[model samples]
Target chain A: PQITLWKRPLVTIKIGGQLKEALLDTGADDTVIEEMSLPGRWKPKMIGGIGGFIKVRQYDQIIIEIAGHKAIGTVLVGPTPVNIIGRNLLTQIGATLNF
Target chain B: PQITLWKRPLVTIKIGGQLKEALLDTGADDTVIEEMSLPGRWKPKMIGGIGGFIKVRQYDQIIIEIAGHKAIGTVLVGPTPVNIIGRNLLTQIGATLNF
Candidate 1:
């Protein structure tokens, strides 16, 4: 299935059994979400973006759903202006950059 | 046609008759270049990203080519870590987010 890029290309996602809207950031390789509760423990990690770097907890095997499409992948949670859904999950759902 | 998001999703782009590689960044709204010469003049502008913000010169009516596809759109050039091909150019190619 194909979805049009919105003016901002935002979408609703279910991560860690919670609902949140995230930016579809193909610019990035991994999804980064604001801090939340998870079932398992993770290591401390730092992620760099156009803005610089953010400290995050790398939760592995997290479940994420986008428009009812469910996939399990890594979720980085920390202080971020907005949630980002990156290529790690996009590829699992067979999403691609299409013209 | 659909192009698989490279692990980095980088692609070769020809901007203002110069070839360069850019990141396919859905997170960005406008096309940005590191630095280049455009045929016409442009106004000063700023672009904000995950890292922060950067000053740029916005050149309009710049032609761009990606994988043999040609598009003419706004191009921003200045000091950037790298070039980003954003939604402005993606939409011109009739590209979309797909699964």
Candidate 2:
């Protein structure tokens, strides 16, 4: 079997009282936060997108570190049942995904 | 105890073959996907930020549904990592977070 080389960094953050790690995907357009891990005060909102939009909630800004780099950004709190790092921030850094 | 009224919608997505729910956090600057649920082909890269940068990878696009609306967006595949819905998409739809 051959292993493919992906060219993005991994980020970690503390949510719902637990520290979690995630991959940075530039292909995605929004930041998805797990609802289950969200704090009690946060609320949800509905948003529209290219295909349409959905109802999303809001959460506090959490500190994240990737490849030894760190920054504070807000995260959506929702039910992971999967977490994701979308394109919003990816574009800011000017990144590309190679797999 | 005082209960705060949050005015965001909830979005659900299927990652790594599981449907997960997350809150729409406008405060967030980007979208996040779980690392644990990511498929085994994606890789990680290092990205810079205001504080610094970190290593993140790429993943596949997942279908999401919110408030009876649906769309397909790429998600950052990573480890139970908390998920987040950030500002980029929120701003596209002119949404506000009431909490």
Candidate 3:
């Protein structure tokens, strides 16, 4: 799907049997979601962004259905105000930026 | 131009007569660049993201040439690791996301 950048390119995604909305962020290196519980052992990780760095829980080999397309990749749970589907998962779903 | 998500969508932009590379970010609400000098009076502002909030200088009516496309908008100068061209500038350049 083509998404115009006039507004946040938010899309619906399904993760861990729950539906949520996420922004398709080409700038972010990893996919970070709002803090949530996932059934597995995750490693403590630190990720940085526009503001600063934050510690998060990194879970690998997670399946996320984005805009009806399935993507399997690493997921980070942190204190993000909104869910962000970054280049890590965007590549999995073949997402791109066009002008 | 169509940019694949396989790599970071970094593009050259001319700001204040200086050429620099920036990432096209859809998740960011405003454009934020690393500490830089812009000629004008700017107001103190604070922006938040994944980790927390940070102090920044907000310069309004800044003209930036993004990938050769002209974009006039408010620009935030802060301690970001990299320059980010957010939705504000992306919309001006008619950028979009596709899958």
Q: Which ten residues in a row have the lowest lDDT in candidate 3 chain A?
A: A46-55
Per-residue CA lDDT of model 3 for B4-58, tens digit only, reads: 9888889999998899999888888899998889999899999988667889999
What tens digits encode model 3's per-residue C-alpha lDDT throughout A1-99? Answer: 888887778889999899999988888889999988887889999988756788999999998999999998899998888899989999989888888
The CAPRI class of candidate 3 is high
| Candidate order (TM-score) | 3, 1, 2
List-wise, what DockQ does each model earn?
0.64, 0.03, 0.82
The best candidate by TM-score is 3
Clashing pairs in 1: A50-B51, A51-B50, A51-B51, A51-B52, A52-B51
lDDT of 1 by residue, A20-46 (tens): 898887887898888788889899998
lDDT of 1 by residue, B31-58 (tens): 8888777887899997666556778899
lDDT, candidate 2, A1-99, per-residue tens: 111122223457444556666555332455565555554456676543222334567665654443344544556654332355554443333333211
Error of 3 at B87 (Å): 0.7
Q: Which regions of candidate 3 fall more than 4 Å away from where they truly are?
A: none
TM-score of 2: 0.35
Writing each residue's lDDT as its tens digit, candidate 2 over B1-99 gives 111112223457544556777655433355555555444466564433212344556554555543334545544433313465544444433343211
